[PDB]
Ligand binder design. Structure first.
Ligand SMILES: O=P(O)(O)OC[C@H](O)CO
Ligand SMILES: [Zn+2]
Ligand SMILES: [Zn+2]
Ligand SMILES: [Zn+2]
Ligand SMILES: [Zn+2]
Ligand SMILES: [Zn+2]
Length: 308
C-alpha cells in the first residue's frame, strides 16, 4: 500500500481539517488497500514554503495550503489572489475555471507540482486586533501577523500596519508575549482556532480571500495508476464541495458565537482601503505583463454573467 503524506496547517477544529478527514477516509477505502493517505494537521509536518518544496521536489506528499505558495514557483498566482479583488466566493470559483488559470496549473506542472484543486475556500479575511479599524490611519502602529507571503506582507503594509510573517501555530504565543498586536483571517479561522480568546475587535476589511490549493508532486502523481488518479481527483473535488457548503453554512452560526464571546464586529471605510492597496498590484516584477488587465477582463465578464 502506497503511503502518501497529506500535510496541512489547519487545526482539528477547523472545517478544512474536518473535510480532509472525510476525503482521506474515502480515498483510502476506494483504493481497495492500494493507497494509504495519512493526514497530518496543525503543522505537525512541513507546511507553506517547506511543504511546497517537498511537493516540487518529487515527494510522496500532498500539500493543502494557500494559493500564495504556488506563486513562489508560478508568479501569476499572486495576482489571481490579489487584495480586494473578489466580492464573492462565486466570483473566485469561476475565475479558477477560466483558461487563464488552467494555464497557470500547467505552468505549475512544468515545475513538478500537480494542482488537484484551487477550490478549498475558507472565507474572506479581516482584521483580528484589539482596536476597531475604520480607516488605514487606525492601522498605523499595529504589529499584525501575516502568513509567510509577499502578497500578505505588501497588502498589510499598504493598509497602514506593520506585518510580521509567521506560520499560524506560532501566533498564540506571539500574542501572549506581545510580539504581535493582532492578526488577520476569516470567521471560520477566528472561531476555529479560538483566537477570540486573545483579541476581541474584528474589523471587516475583507482584504484577501482565504483559499487553499491542494497539490501533489508530479512524480508521485505520474507513478500512480489510472484508477488511483481518478479516485484522488474525484474525492478532493467532493471534499472541496463539502468544505465550501459547510463554510457557507457556518459563517452565520460562528459570527453569532464570536459575538457571544465578546467579539465586536466593525465596519470599514471600504473606499479608502481600496485606494490604499491598489499599489500592491504594481509591486511584482516577475508577473507576466498585463496579467492584471487580463484578470480584470475575465472578472468583468464573470460579473456580467452573475447579474444575468
Ligand atoms: O492562512 P493562515 O496561514 O493565516 O492560517 C489560517 C488557518 O485557519 C489557521 O490554522
Ligand atoms: Zn488530530
Ligand atoms: Zn466516515
Ligand atoms: Zn457557480
Ligand atoms: Zn465599531
Ligand atoms: Zn497599477
Amino acid at each position: 500500500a502506497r503511503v502518501i503524506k497529506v500535510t496541512t496547517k489547519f487545526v482539528d477544529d477547523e472545517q478544512t481539517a474536518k473535510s480532509l478527514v472525510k476525503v482521506v477516509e474515502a480515498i483510502n477505502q476506494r483504493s481497495n488497500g492500494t493507497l494509504e493517505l495519512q493526514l497530518f494537521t496543525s503543522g505537525t509536518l512541513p507546511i507553506g514554503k517547506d511543504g511546497m518544496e517537498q511537493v516540487a521536489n518529487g515527494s510522496d506528499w500532498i500539500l493543502v495550503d494557500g494559493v500564495n505558495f504556488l506563486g513562489d514557483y508560478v508568479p501569476d498566482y499572486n495576482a489571481v489572489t490579489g487584495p480586494m479583488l473578489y466580492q464573492s466566493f462565486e466570483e473566485y470559483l469561476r475565475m479558477v475555471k477560466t483558461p487563464l488559470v488552467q494555464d497557470l496549473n500547467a505552468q505549475a506542472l512544468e515545475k513538478g507540482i500537480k494542482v488537484l484543486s484551487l477550490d478549498w475556500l475558507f472565507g474572506f479575511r479581516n482584521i483580528e486586533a484589539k482596536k476597531p479599524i475604520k480607516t488605514p490611519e487606525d492601522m498605523k502602529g499595529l504589529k499584525l501577523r501575516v502568513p509567510t507571503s509577499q502578497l500578505y506582507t505588501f497588502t498589510i503594509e499598504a493598509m497602514g500596519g506593520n506585518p510580521v510573517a509567521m506560520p499560524y501555530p506560532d501566533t498564540y504565543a506571539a500574542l501572549q508575549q506581545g510580539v504581535i498586536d493582532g492578526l488577520e483571517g476569516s470567521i471560520l479561522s477566528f472561531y476555529g482556532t479560538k483566537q477570540y480568546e486573545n483579541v476581541k475587535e474584528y474589523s471587516l476589511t475583507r482584504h484577501l480571500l482565504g483559499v487553499s490549493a491542494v497539490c501533489i508532486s508530479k512524480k508521485c502523481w505520474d507513478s500512480l495508476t489510472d484508477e488511483q488518479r481518478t479516485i484522488i481527483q474525484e474525492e478532493f473535488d467532493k471534499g472541496a464541495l463539502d468544505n465550501l457548503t459547510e463554510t457557507e453554512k457556518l459563517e452565520d452560526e460562528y459570527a453569532q458565537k464570536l459575538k457571544d464571546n465578546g467579539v465586536t464586529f466593525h465596519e470599514v471605510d471600504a473606499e479608502a482601503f481600496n485606494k490604499a492597496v491598489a499599489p500592491v498590484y504594481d509591486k511584482f516584477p516577475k508577473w507576466t505583463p498585463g496579467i492584471y488587465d487580463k484578470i480584470m477582463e475575465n472578472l468583468t465578464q464573470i460579473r456580467e454573467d452573475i447579474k444575468n
